[PDB]
Design a protein around this ligand. Sequence first.
Ligand SMILES: *[C@@H]1O[C@H](CO)[C@@H](O[C@@H]2O[C@H](CO)[C@@H](O)[C@H](O)[C@H]2NC(C)=O)[C@H](O)[C@H]1NC(C)=O
Ligand SMILES: *[C@@H]1O[C@H](CO)[C@@H](O[C@@H]2O[C@H](CO)[C@@H](O)[C@H](O)[C@H]2NC(C)=O)[C@H](O)[C@H]1NC(C)=O
Ligand SMILES: *[C@@H]1O[C@H](CO)[C@@H](O[C@@H]2O[C@H](CO)[C@@H](O)[C@H](O)[C@H]2NC(C)=O)[C@H](O)[C@H]1NC(C)=O
Ligand SMILES: *[C@@H]1O[C@H](CO)[C@@H](O)[C@H](O)[C@H]1NC(C)=O
Ligand SMILES: *[C@@H]1O[C@H](CO)[C@@H](O)[C@H](O)[C@H]1NC(C)=O
Lengths: 88, 106
Amino acid sequence: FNGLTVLPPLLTDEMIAQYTSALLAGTITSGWTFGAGAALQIPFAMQMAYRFNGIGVTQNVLYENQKLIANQFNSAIGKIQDSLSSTA
Amino acid sequence: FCGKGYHLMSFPQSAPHGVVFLHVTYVPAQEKNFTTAPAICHDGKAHFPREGVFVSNGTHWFVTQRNFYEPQIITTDNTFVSGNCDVVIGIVNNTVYDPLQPELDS
Ligand SMILES: *[C@@H]1O[C@H](CO)[C@@H](O[C@@H]2O[C@H](CO)[C@@H](O)[C@H](O)[C@H]2NC(C)=O)[C@H](O)[C@H]1NC(C)=O
Ligand SMILES: *[C@@H]1O[C@H](CO)[C@@H](O[C@@H]2O[C@H](CO)[C@@H](O)[C@H](O)[C@H]2NC(C)=O)[C@H](O)[C@H]1NC(C)=O
Ligand SMILES: *[C@@H]1O[C@H](CO)[C@@H](O[C@@H]2O[C@H](CO)[C@@H](O)[C@H](O)[C@H]2NC(C)=O)[C@H](O)[C@H]1NC(C)=O
Ligand SMILES: *[C@@H]1O[C@H](CO)[C@@H](O)[C@H](O)[C@H]1NC(C)=O
Ligand SMILES: *[C@@H]1O[C@H](CO)[C@@H](O)[C@H](O)[C@H]1NC(C)=O
């Protein structure tokens, strides 16, 4: 106002959200294949077996406990809403 | 970390007040659609691939590695028996070839 200028950023608020949406769709529908090359479609119920295989856990644990893992993940995402709102 | 694609190796190059890296990467170019399944049922047991994923060309099911298309006949050497077919979701039915069977008969 008296010699200070605040330049606007190159990417707007909705521009950042669209970039994160593209990465979110690529991670869910393709895993890590979209980062290396083209988007390779793969089921999410089968993508998690690849992640367990990388940490020393066989793929039979995921399919035998698919309902328990899905319920545990949904409860963990919902806890972020209460943790961020209550604890500022 | 070493450029786009699957990193293989890299080469160093001298430069004025810096360094130049020549990262050699593995990047796939062509792809094909394939029907998959997480496991198969041979005699009531759920068979999971040791390495790779099950794919189907429309008439038969094969197992191949994730990064390259090399279809192979599903056998007991390439799959491990675990659990049951009821707990697995999306399981299909397929006959597992046994390499021990023709040796004992011949
Ligand atoms: C392993 O832990 C999970 C959760 O940590 C258990 O799943 C819960 O079990 C209780 C009682 O059996 C149920 O009331 C809940 O609905 C379950 N699901 C949750 C919290 O998402 C599970 O029983 C434990 N044991 C085994 C053998 O898996
Ligand atoms: C899926 O792959 C199988 C395995 O090769 C194919 O089965 C054979 O395909 C050859 C083609 O070179 C034929 O000569 C054989 O007669 C086929 N054998 C049988 C038992 O079918 C199969 O044709 C492929 N299916 C598709 C739709 O491509
Ligand atoms: C794989 O084969 C089994 C049996 O070999 C199928 O199980 C049968 O399913 C039908 C329809 O759901 C039932 O009426 C039979 O009673 C079942 N038999 C047994 C022994 O359980 C199974 O459905 C097949 N898998 C698929 C995907 O079709
Ligand atoms: C796989 O099938 C979908 C179905 O619409 C199609 O859009 C896609 O191009 C196919 N993949 C290839 C590599 O042709
Ligand atoms: C895949 O989803 C479709 C859509 O509901 C469903 O009809 C089909 O049975 C599903 N297949 C498997 C193997 O879950």
